[PDB]
Amino acid sequence: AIIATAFAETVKFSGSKQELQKRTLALYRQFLRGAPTFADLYEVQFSIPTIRTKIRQEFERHRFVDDLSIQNVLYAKGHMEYQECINFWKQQAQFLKYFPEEDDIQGRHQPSNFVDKFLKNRA
Template sequence: MTLPTAFAETTRFSMSSAEMRIRVLNLYRRYLRHSRNFVNNYDLDVPASQVKTKIRQEFERQRFVNDLAVQNVLYMKAQMEFQELVNFWKQQCHVMMYFEPFSSYDNTANDSFIDKFLKGAS
């Protein structure tokens, strides 16, 4: 059983890039350590190695953000996401959305009316 406050973290801002780097690396390691639990808890159809790859991609996507205030916000969002995942506050469909290609979100431009209707798009 997981206590909801077990992975909670108080909101605090990093005052230097070095401090932020340490916090981000620690959060990244926590994500990787729990990747197998994510697969098991959410009954995902993907192997843990693919989950680890996706975690890496999500962290790499924000790698070149240089503004410390933006880094702090991104860190807090990632921390909240981690707590929601670990405490099983999400459903499987929410977790699987990370594994959908971004092109599938806006593929309605070339679809016919029937295709859009069947997909539920307006």
């Protein structure tokens, strides 16, 4: 037969929110645990605390989503991502997509008020 691969979890939509939050916290713990493995695999310049900070931000972004089905989908995609990272399927190029802030300063002019945006036709 075709058997599942490493860190594969069968797709299951939780019927109750609480049973989903259990899995969600497990997944968060897995990501935090794997952070050093990610730092070794992908030869990152930045520190393990920064990996963990990024993970916390990612989990934070959906902290107020209510409808259960959307939470189920987000959890499934988060697990798919975890499996992608931990198995070194991803390369450094795609991994660093997650990390747009640690790249250097892109330039002198990042407009913030209406006059600087207007001068660059981005108002």
